[model samples]
Target: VRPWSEFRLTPAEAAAAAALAARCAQRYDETDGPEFLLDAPVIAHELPRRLRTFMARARLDAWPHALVVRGNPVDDAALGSTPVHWRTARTPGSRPLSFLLMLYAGLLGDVFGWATQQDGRVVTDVLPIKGGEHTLVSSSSRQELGWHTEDAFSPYRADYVGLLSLRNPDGVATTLAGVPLDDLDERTLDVLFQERFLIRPDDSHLQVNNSTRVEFEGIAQAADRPEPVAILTGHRAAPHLRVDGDFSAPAEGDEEAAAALGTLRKLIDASLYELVLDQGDVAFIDNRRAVHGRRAFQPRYDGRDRWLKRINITRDLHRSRKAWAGDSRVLG
Candidate 1:
């Protein structure tokens, strides 16, 4: 679990990444959608070079991780560049230069692949204080904060979760927090690793009630003697996680399991590393080891307000990914 700070770029590499970003923006603008023609020669020529150069400096590039990118675009590049062929559309809150996300994750053979819409919900509208559903709740108090992973219900989740800050906070900074699973005690770790729980929908999940369906039978039963979760699987060398307990249920329907769930929450809270994402800031969290959440903040809704664009990527299916089976949405 590394912070965005741990991954650094040299003067020359930074210049190269910037150049790549500009070129990508131009190509995406010309294409006019989220899905850029990655197979094109111009893209084929420059995309890999830029991604490889960035990967050269990124120590955690091997696993799923997020890279906070800077530079905001004026156009609706997200929906425009995104290919209509995909199962989902881009969010209105997304800014330009976001097209780079599709380029690197899709074209350059990076460890990223967006999750498809499950049941039926497309991730076109799930964020921003004004437009988003409270189902994906942290706080409605306009000052309340939330900490957890995105899409805890989906069977397959990305190794990393990425967030790019398009706008900065005025007065109230957006606080994003992370903590590693390796830091947890054996007992709590055991509970998370156990397949003893099930994920339910958050308010956002419910709002998209038209989007996906619930899994009542699969949730770990209370009498199952506490099984490991779908979140913590793969080689223990570096385990992955898909945890959002508030929306998850115990299979057996026992209150004791709920009490046990508190320990996992405590592990995350104790290790919380708050990130006050600023303009042009990008954050990558290890989905396997870290759980993250956002702090409650006041939103003026003035054009200059807090806004962050997110992208989720999973590893290839034949690779270590197929192990996670359920729905495509990351969480319930």
Candidate 2:
């Protein structure tokens, strides 16, 4: 809805994209169905050069944001240029080296936002309904999944929500929702920007109901009190959003903020952008600025289930130094 000329890959850039796509096509031809492939050494070595060309032509030198490339498959052979091993080195049948290289290349174009789940890792392989071709093999899977940003409760929220479609049920639409805080009435902006609320992890992240809690820059604080809830906050006006209607326990003092929260939700509910990404189409977001969610659809298990591959990246590479105790990568 917002004119997005500033965030699109241009025509000349499309030619470059096509060349990269050729590599993907080669691999797709070489591999079997639903293959989890990676770039080979040869492709990896030349990735930087190709990535540079696209970035320069796109005039995205200080592209401070991120890039999401879809419309073509990528070759695993091209993944040799990256520092990360595509496959979870420990897990066999993992994404190959070429995949990593392509991803790294994507980042150089300023396209590196990460996916974080409350449960830690941000990967999911949604399955299709069994034996159902006309109708979705699963129930309620296509229903409207409510609006919420990923990792709203964590100190490190996702800078972008990148959803790369490997397969999407025909005619199904994926919708993104958000309150245009930047465009809100000054009065509402005054109240929402300064206030903060409590946040309790949603069921997806936290194991217990009230075991973990965090509060934003609100007026109150108590260990047992509740988490802070704010529409926005961070390096910008609103930092991080953390509220799970099911799990967030706002305190007695949060009534006005709660009322405001409902209104914000209404704004999000009212304005939405729908996109149906074909295979190889990737949707990237500035998680810092926008909130995203999806419209539901039926998944028929006709070998062409609506599936997506998700990869998260923190453009601030130095931050990788702080990995969890058991994990090799510093993703907290």
Candidate 3:
């Protein structure tokens, strides 16, 4: 088996899942709403038994970097047009699908989001923004989003990142690369596992995402004075990965660390490949196992560009208590 698995749902299975999502949609105001968050797990338990079984086993033995499900039904007319900006993308057409994504995510783990990203939305949008075509964030279209461990700056980053495709008319590809252990030298591996790396917060946390000035201050401070950490951990043969291609660097005066990062960049660049998720497809990417990004594509602001609903999941919710803001799911 490859480091990823893909399954296509039967029409009956897909309808059953959609019906469950509809039920949740009718009960909860929104996926991120307090009522919904409190009720998602119960609703998730009612998902297709076979699908839940796969998720349960996959979580325990995550041999693959990602698990994908395809063949869900999505009516373009019902989904409407893709919004021009993340701010306005939460359309009624996308609401039930958001519930669907949350139901799938709920099977894997507890879902959360960054306090400073997309106004702390738990069910976030991933459509091309008009003016951010060349930026490093997910909203950028012309610029290929650089591969990174999601929220590499935070210890409370997600264990799994879930994405559901509503539309991808252009067939743009998502990028992924696992650790190039086959080619890495022992010296390089040693350097990578040491606490000599500085991984800053990505542009998604910046003020552009509607972060308040006070929230932006905390993000800026963290970015300015980031703590040194490791790029890899766990078993030598199958070590976990933690590095951001655009936001990672060596600690001050760490020449060996820089060299390791340089080599790693080359290895990852050479190994990266496409993982395209077409319409009605969902993928749960293992954040600890692989680095992922998006390929550059031409954005048609005509409200029919590629769009996906995204959520972050952790195996344990309490592991991030220190960063938790009050009782909500958004992490600081």
Candidate 4:
């Protein structure tokens, strides 16, 4: 894939959009409101015209692996300090920006979250925790996060993963890579496009990561007995991607499938690239077009560190009707 598409808002435009988000914060109690969730896409029309236009056109660009929007204003004092854990992360200082991310994300597609993750919050936080620094989840600071499709084990995975960086004083780089089509042999490509791979649910979906610790049957089943799935699909030239670098494996006793996965992993690792988002910058990763993770960085337990707001988006909400948590958009 080629370079990602980017749109930078001028100071005046950024200020205007910031004001609109502040208004939304004042009008609504939280972004999780079913009413706010339903209205975000419509309310997004009030953002700067240029930013809206970028979202409309960039999303259709076949070559871009992600869409980046920068220049939103974030006051550290208002944002306060990074939370210790995701459960207690949504401080008052984080409200307007949380609303801002949803509004920008609304322009691209429908925003949703997992019922078993981050206590089922539609807007989730990404910040390093004191004890979880070595873990393989988003909060891990010392361990490098390998590139993978977001929620590869679920058919209801997002089409786009939106990230809003609240603060990043150290300039941490997020990793990304498109399919290594040119490097793969025809036989490997053929196997990858076939349903001969197993993708187990990642640790983020486990009982340990979620605050509720609810025994969700869907996640449990996927972790214990995953079904076969294809790693690649659609056009051969630019097929969509679905593989977890750590959790993906060959179907039982499938030597040919194992060989294909091995080659794919080597190629992807060799081609991985970095995209760093500074404070107040936002990026929408095309979950189908490319895989993403993060580089390892040392944790600074001080109030200031790398903290980000994240949301998942799907093109059609009805596609996951079966996974809906009652009447809300939080898919199980």
The clash count for each model shown is 39, 40, 0, 0
TM-score between model 2 and native: 0.61
- The model with the greater TM-score, 2 or 4, is 4
Query: Candidate 1's residue-wise lDDT over 1-332, tens digit each?
Result: 54543434455654555466566666554322324533322453464454455544553454443454433333432333322211232443242335544444443233322222323322222233453324355323253445556656555455556655555545334333443556666665556566777664344333233343243223323223334354456655566666674555555665545555666667666766566656555555556556666655555544455554455655543343443334222232
lDDT of each: 0.47, 0.43, 0.90, 0.92
Candidate RMSDs in Å, in order, are 6.9, 9.1, 1.2, 1.2
lDDT of 2 by residue, 204-229 (tens): 33232112322221112322455455
In candidate 2, residue 8 scores what lDDT? 39
**Candidate with better lDDT, 1 vs 4:** 4
Off by over 4 Å in 1: 1-5, 8-19, 28-37, 40-51, 54-95, 104-127, 131-145, 171-185, 207-231, 235-238, 254-256, 317-332
What does candidate 3 score on TM?
Answer: 0.97
Stretches of model 2 off by over 4 angstroms after superposition: 1-45, 48-68, 73-140, 206-226, 234-251, 317-323, 328-332
What 10-residue stretch in candidate 3 is worst by lDDT? 208-217
For model 3, what is the alpha-carbon lDDT of residue 130? Answer: 87
Check candidate 4 and list the clashing pairs.
Answer: none
Deviation of model 1 at 175, angstroms = 5.3
| Candidate 3 C-alpha lDDT tens digits along 290-319 | 999999999998979999999999989899
